[PDB]
Each structure stands twice: as structure tokens, then as C-alpha cells.
Amino acid sequence: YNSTFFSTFKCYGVCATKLNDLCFSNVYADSFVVKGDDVRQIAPGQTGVI
Amino acid sequence: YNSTFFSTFKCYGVCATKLNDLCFSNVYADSFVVKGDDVRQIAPGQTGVI
Numbered sequence: 223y224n225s226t227f228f229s230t231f232k233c234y235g236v237c238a239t240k241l242n243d244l245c246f247s248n249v250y251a252d253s254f255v256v257k258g259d260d261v262r263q264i265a266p267g268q269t270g271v272i
Numbered sequence: 273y274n275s276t277f278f279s280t281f282k283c284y285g286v287c288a289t290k291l292n293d294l295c296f297s298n299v300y301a302d303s304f305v306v307k308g309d310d311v312r313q314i315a316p317g318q319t320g321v322i
């Protein structure tokens with residue numbers, strides 16, 4: 223909360239206000255770099271080049 | 273996919289992933305120019321000058 227600030231943060235299947243009260247089973251992190259217009263394509267139902 | 277890139281692309285009444293599987297009846301294209309803050313008003317159920 224003092225260092226890193228996110229322009230997009232969106233959660234699917236779970237309320238964002240309850241992430242502090244849960245425990246998670248199989249956690250994986252995928253990393254990549256896109257341009258600014260292509261961030262809207264990282265979503266469950268989407269079309270486009272990405 | 274090599275030339276034109278869209279800042280917004282949103283579809284209503286259909287999932288975007290199925291546009292390659294369908295065939296469309298009465299296609300019309302409406303063209304105009306707005307400013308950056310007025311793009312959010314091209315949606316059903318909006319208020320604003322546009």
C-alpha cells in the first residue's frame with residue numbers, strides 16, 4: 223500500500239472484500255507484457271489477437 | 273491484426289467468441305467522431321449531451 227499501485231485489478235468467482243478471510247488451494251501466477259489497448263482482452267470471454 | 277487496433281470493442285446480444293460461427297441479417301454501420309470522455313455514452317441506457 224506504499225509502493226505498488228495497479229491500474230487494473232479485477233477478480234472473478236470471488237468477492238474482493240473476502241480475500242482476507244479465505245485460504246487458497248492451487249495458486250499459480252502467469253506473467254507477461256502487453257500494450258495498453260490489449261489489457262481489455264485479458265478476460266474470460268474475449269476476441270482479438272491476444 | 274497487423275494494422276488497426278481498437279481502444280474499445282464491446283458487443284451486445286452475443287458472445288464475441290462466436291462471431292466466426294454465425295451469419296448476420298441486416299448489417300448497418302454508423303460512423304461519427306466524439307471526444308475521449310464522450311465514448312462511455314455510446315451504450316444502452318445512458319444520459320449525457322450525446
Ligand SMILES: CCCCC/C=C\C/C=C\CCCCCCCC(=O)O
Nearest residue numbers: 269270271273278281291296299301
Ligand atoms: C465493416 C463492416 C463489418 C460487418 C461485420 C458484421 C458482423 C461481424 C461483427 C463483428 C466483426 C467485425 C467487427 C470488427 C471486430 C474487430 C475485432 C478485433 O480485431 O479485435
Ligand SMILES: CCCCC/C=C\C/C=C\CCCCCCCC(=O)O
Nearest residue numbers: 309310311312313318319320321322
Ligand atoms: C449539487 C446538486 C446535487 C444534485 C443531486 C440530486 C439528484 C441526483 C440526480 C441526478 C444528479 C446528476 C448529477 C450530474 C450528472 C451529469 C450527467 C452528465 O452530464 O453526464
Ligand SMILES: *[C@@H]1O[C@H](CO)[C@@H](O)[C@H](O)[C@H]1NC(C)=O
Nearest residue numbers: 223224225226227228229242
Ligand atoms: C512505506 O514506504 C515509505 C516510503 O519511504 C517508507 O518510508 C515506509 O516506511 C513504508 N512503510 C512501512 C510500513 O515500511
Ligand SMILES: *[C@@H]1O[C@H](CO)[C@@H](O)[C@H](O)[C@H]1NC(C)=O
Nearest residue numbers: 270271272273274275276277
Ligand atoms: C501485416 O503488416 C505487415 C506490415 O509491414 C506486412 O509486412 C505483413 O505482410 C502483413 N500481413 C499480411 C498477412 O499481409
